[PDB]
Amino acid sequence: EFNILLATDSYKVTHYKQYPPNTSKVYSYFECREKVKYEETVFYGLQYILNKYLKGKVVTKEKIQEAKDVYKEHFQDDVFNEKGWNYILEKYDGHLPIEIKAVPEGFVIPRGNVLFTVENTDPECYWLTNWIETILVQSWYPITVATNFREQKKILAKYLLETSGNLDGLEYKLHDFGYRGVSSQETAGIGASAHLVNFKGTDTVAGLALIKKYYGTKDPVPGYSVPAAEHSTITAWGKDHEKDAFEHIVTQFSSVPVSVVSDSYDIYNACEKIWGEDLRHLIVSRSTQAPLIIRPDSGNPLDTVLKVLEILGKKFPVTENSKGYKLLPPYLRVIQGDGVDINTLQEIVEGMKQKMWSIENIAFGSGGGLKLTRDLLNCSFKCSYVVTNGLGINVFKDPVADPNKRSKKGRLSLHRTPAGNFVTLEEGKGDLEEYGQDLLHTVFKNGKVTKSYSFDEIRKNAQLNIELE
Amino acid sequence: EFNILLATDSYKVTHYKQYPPNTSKVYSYFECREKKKYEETVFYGLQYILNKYLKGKVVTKEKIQEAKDVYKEHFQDDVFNEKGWNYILEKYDGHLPIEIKAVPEGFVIPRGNVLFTVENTDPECYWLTNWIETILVQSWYPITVATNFREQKKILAKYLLETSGNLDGLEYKLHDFGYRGVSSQETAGIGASAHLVNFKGTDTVAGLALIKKYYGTKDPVPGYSVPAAEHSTITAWGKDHEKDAFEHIVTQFSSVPVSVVSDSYDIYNACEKIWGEDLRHLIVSRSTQAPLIIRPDSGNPLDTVLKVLEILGKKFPVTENSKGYKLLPPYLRVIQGDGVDINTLQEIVEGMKQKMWSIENIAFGSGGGLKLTRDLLNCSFKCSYVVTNGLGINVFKDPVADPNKRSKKGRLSLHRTPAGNFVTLEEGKGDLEEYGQDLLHTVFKNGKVTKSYSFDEIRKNAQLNIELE
């Protein structure tokens, strides 16, 4: 079972002895510190952490003893604050005397703004604020995943709108195929849930269950998939029977969309001769609700997509839409799921546009051929205010060799500007009442989640301006 | 509770309808595919996955129903092999009819070799081999982390030996500080355990629990830490009292090693004036077993390390070791934990060597200021052999635009070559017995872990040649 006393950076075990004597308050905050890309971030994922790890009785006699014994061996010394943890156990029935304020989940906020704050609600637990830094800082991951997929969606939306005149199906243009490529089962759930803030197509089932348990959606599930082949279901037929494989698969899945990986041996032969000739009769008979989705999975992503489209464009009836772009028939689509990061996504849709192919023809997969870190958005947790001997003091770091690492001073609040933008006020200045109400909400207090958001409101908060029309 | 029926890529749910009819066997393998440097990989982490996710009764009626319900909504269609899963539940008491053979954990194997194979042990469960690809492929992470840290260890060892004449303390030269920068609690444990294959210093406690549970060590713990300050415990004293903070902390931890982050405001002033003058008397009095460890954490990693060393060398008595390199007194050391990836590590030690500073003077920390992916070592799982209508056929992919993605054919085995290197035999050629014993051993069969390795064995297997000498 998870033990919060063992879920911190080792050195933090020793910090209660390092703060100034008679420190009653330690107040800290999280931001995506400022540095033309990633100018605004989606705040998402804290609610998962609050619920899974921080809420309720998180301290017990057994957990304290377990922690004591581990740290004794780990430090080769007795440095563990048994008394402090016993105090939380005895006084608060193991509930953390901590208050956390945060911007609403799904909110899109410019870099360099306070996103959440953490402070102890009991003077005895001054050390607790930064003990939980490590666990809270991991919010960097869902924030960054949600932000990066939103930035990909912006690109897709721009080009889909330009080439088609609408945004129909945008939420299905970037399918998450990343399950095998993440570092653990837990990460798969978190990352997928972050993808699903932006999109609805996913092969990472773990995301659904996390969203259901921690957020909730009006719909039965937040994300969907369709039958698709992998290389093993094609190659198992034998090198000379790729056509037989294709035929079997599209016949098994004749009334639903089906994606068929087409590059096991020769993607271009597969498109021109197998799909485009030998099996063409099975493709042109398919319903608009059940297209064949051809999947290349190798070679230069851009060149391969453009060549596949040209091949298909000559074997199938192509129309020109109202915007002047070429459109495959509705029973035939392409998905490119190899090497698609934000850069190559941009490259492919621009390349298609230059060749007069509608973005309607294509979808993308995120997974193979790819990497986001805590430093991408400079996600950082810092102490900004302490009370020692009853005197509050504004604290910060400001390293001489890196002004970018300067942290904020004093008690923080988030506000609307007269123009309707966000501004973070420092040094308790929000109390001057010149900038209206603090936009942060208390979301955790003394062992209880005090405010939460459904996955539906998170998605609405995370919407693109272009979607808002 | 974890449900294996929900822990695969969604599309795999549909693959039982896509393999050739009358297929009784699907045999698949994992390799770190060669790429036309990371020439050798540490095989590590499968045992964790076998134990946590695959062994024992992993199928129940409730899990089948849970999956049935999820997939019905997720696919908006009833595709789901309920009968196939029922069969495993009824016939094998929910144990997976799968055999996995693997190279021993800790083994260091060149790229392009079979590391493990997977096959169904019952004809009815041909579909199961690749169902579990997703969960098994996540072994990419502990493999890549263990491999990357071993490669960093190689560099450290090379330079430590050159500048000092020995490898003393090598296992403590790269401390894991990466807890807050990974994507989840589970990843933290996995990644830390992989770091610990190579090193002993860690602030990620989760690594210890995982090792104890899944591998085991003679020693009580596989990894250690020491007291250390973070910016909050320094900055909380107020900008005018950094010296007071330093004094408090080193006095609190007078008899053990103590690391003190010294760049809150001005790392160079801190070293020269605070440590080097004001508090020098508290430093030169310390034991060799309890050094002060100065920690810069900002600026150019190389430039800052060299400048810190130059400062300290002028304030403290420096010796010249037998190799002609400068050495700080034993009560004083430096740790650089910002921006230290393999490339920067190399730059720093080479930079130090150029300025005649022994590597004895420095340690490094990983995590913060830096992102390994599945494609780094091209960790891949592919089907190479199937039996259809009683006939075995050797199968593979070989995409025309990317020969690097060609996969191996037929039944595989791993062998020592006459010169003592490694070779993977394809097409069942291992059966000819021309190459000695198959190095792959059955580690999993029909729900049981059949062979396990201790963490001590893994560490021994993963040793550097330089350590062997």
Residue numbers in the entry:
A (entry chain B): 8 to 42, 52 to 386, 389 to 487
B (entry chain A): 8 to 43, 53 to 386, 389 to 487
From the paper:
NAMPT functions as a homo-dimeric enzyme that catalyzes the rate limiting step in the primary salvage pathway for NAD synthesis, the transfer of a phosphoribosyl residue from 5-phosphoribosyl-1-pyrophosphate (PRPP) to nicotinamide (NAM) to produce nicotinamide mononucleotide (NMN). Furthermore, we determine the crystal structures of six NAMPT mutants in the apo form and in complex with various inhibitors and present a definitive model to explain the differential effects of the mutations on various structural classes of NAMPT inhibitors.
A helical structure of 380GRS is crucial for PRPP binding, as it is situated in the PRPP binding site and the electric dipole moment developed in the helix can complement the negative charges associated with the PRPP 5′-phosphate group. The unwinding of the 380GRS in S165 mutants rendered the structure less compatible with the binding of PRPP. Our structural studies thus reveal that the S165 mutation modulates NAMPT activity by interfering with PRPP binding in an allosteric manner. Consistent with the structural observations, S165F/Y mutant NAMPT proteins required approximately 500 fold more PRPP compared to the wild-type protein and the other NAMPT mutants. Crystal structures revealed a previously underappreciated conformational flexibility in this secondary structure element that can be exploited by resistance mutations through an allosteric mechanism.
